[PDB]
Amino acid sequence: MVHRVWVETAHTHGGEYLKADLGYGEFPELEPIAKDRLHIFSKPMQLVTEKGKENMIQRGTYNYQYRSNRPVKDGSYLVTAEYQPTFRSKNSYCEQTRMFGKNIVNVGHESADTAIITKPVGQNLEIVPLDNPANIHVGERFKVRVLFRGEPLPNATVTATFDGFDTSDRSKTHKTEAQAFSDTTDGKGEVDIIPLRQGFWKASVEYKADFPDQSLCQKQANYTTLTFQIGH
């Protein structure tokens, strides 16, 4: 199984702590980070608000569970997670792998702000929402932009699925990778996700390129995810 990174947040109101989960594995099944993988997630997930980025605290039964340091007010925030760069041999060349996850969390039933969630956080490969998904009904268009090394990335494939779309016969050795959406970005790096069902959605984009410093490593693979809610 190829493991990927995503973020999930609990439904949260103003005045309570924000609870979040680092998914490393096969969406949407959360799993504890294994002993031999703890070094990859050496930095905690981050909460992005008006005051910028802050670390979250790893609290809970399982090591993928985090909470905000302080109770959060009503608003629209980001929770980010990162697979720190790892190097492996392939064939024979070196490849660096990096993964990123970002969750849009609306704290409060009427929160649909865009000031925070539309600003890039600096992920090497990033999906930046250009609108708040709380305003998107089934069949409507939800515009995002893909950034690579800070610049818009054209002709990249963005796919998207939701929790419960593909469940038949899931096991440790079976499928459930079907997507309910796929399109490619334009010259501005933008693409409209069109959700056909309410629920917990995950959009995905990957980019393989040359590693910047060719004297040290040759290739670089990036896998980036954006999670959000459609409906209420």
Added chain:
Amino acid sequence: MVHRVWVETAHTHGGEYLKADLGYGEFPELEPIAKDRLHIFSKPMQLVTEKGKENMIQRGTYNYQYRSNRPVKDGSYLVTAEYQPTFRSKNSYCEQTRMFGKNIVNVGHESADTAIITKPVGQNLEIVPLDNPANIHVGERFKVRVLFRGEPLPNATVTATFDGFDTSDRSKTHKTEAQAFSDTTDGKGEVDIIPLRQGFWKASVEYKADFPDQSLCQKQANYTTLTFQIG
């Protein structure tokens, strides 16, 4: 403007003439085949029934319309179309483009046969339905197989969209339409399409490989579609 090939068939009851349409361009909008492109479609579309393959006659207002020879009996048939192989330079090297279309046509309500439609018609890249779409409701799984050069093609990306999913862009981008489904074929070349809406669906796969005879051309691109009705 990309320009891909698909097939449409009008609603046909048994005993009348099966009208079909060659789509060359941006699904779902049919368009007359331009002058400088006529040589690409040198062979007419084919109707596949119990008696096998038969040519269709290019009858109608526009040059993309085709009518069956004799009227058709109730059943489940295929209508295939082909973009004949063309060569071009890229970068420098030669690439041969081939495209295929296949429509599943159910003549007569309550017809949902699997005998003809599940048989490979021999397209270089082909989507073979392993069930009749008449039995597939919204949310259910429609299994198809992808064959390249007669053999199952694993890890191939099959996408699917429907008429009305993406309603943007006249010509101010001409980009390929948004898809409402995407997944990869398994080791047997099979994949389940999960339609989330009723309507007229098109599934797509493309495979780029080395050309067989490296002394004539270097690359080969294949674009194949399968059109059908859900609900």
